[PDB]
């Protein structure tokens, strides 16, 4: 094994921004959040906003 193996990957900035938008949109759907096992019950609103 050699140290000059490719360890690092570069992703396009537009694709990285795309992934964040998709992650944010999914975080507002309670079905997807419960499918992560996040125990969102008794939570008043899934897009929880506090002062």
């Amino acid at each position: 094994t050699k140290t000059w193996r490719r360890w690092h990957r570069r992703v396009n900035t537009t694709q990285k921004r795309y992934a964040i938008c998709s992650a944010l949109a999914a975080s507002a759907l309670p079905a997807l959040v419960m499918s992560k096992g996040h125990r969102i019950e008794e939570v008043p609103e899934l897009p929880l906003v506090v002062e």
């Binding site: 507002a28 008794e42 939570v43």
Partner: protein, 125 residues
């Protein structure tokens, strides 16, 4: 949308069980507990769930209200039905059919109620 979310959780979920050639789903409002678009208890605007009562007698029927689809705390209305077996089946049948509330799930709710009521009656060897 139900179909959009189903394409996300179809094979990737915390409730998904894959084991010895069969698949199950353990979300709380899934009658028959099967990984299917029709029976998934999280992705629809109206779902029906049948669970045993808090104590050992009766059936609690859960229904998703139309409003507050993004409000988990108030999304579910639960009714405790504790009467004889034939009356319990009739009440669940009327809630699904007379309201036109998910008539696709009528028999599945009734079978699950019979299983729960049977499991509550004493076991004699």
């Amino acid at each position: 949308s139900a179909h959009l979310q189903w394409m996300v959780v179809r094979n990737c979920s915390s409730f998904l069980i894959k084991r010895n050639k069969q698949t199950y789903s353990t979300e709380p409002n899934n009658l028959k507990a099967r990984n299917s678009f029709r029976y998934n208890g999280l992705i629809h605007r109206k779902t029906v769930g049948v669970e045993p009562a808090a104590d050992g007698k009766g059936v609690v029927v859960v229904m998703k209200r139309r409003s507050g689809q993004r409000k988990p705390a108030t999304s579910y209305v639960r009714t405790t039905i504790n009467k004889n077996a034939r009356a319990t089946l009739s009440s669940i049948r009327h809630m699904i059919r007379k309201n036109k509330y998910r008539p696709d799930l009528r028999m599945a709710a009734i079978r699950r109620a019979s299983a729960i009521l049977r499991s509550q009656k004493p076991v004699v060897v």
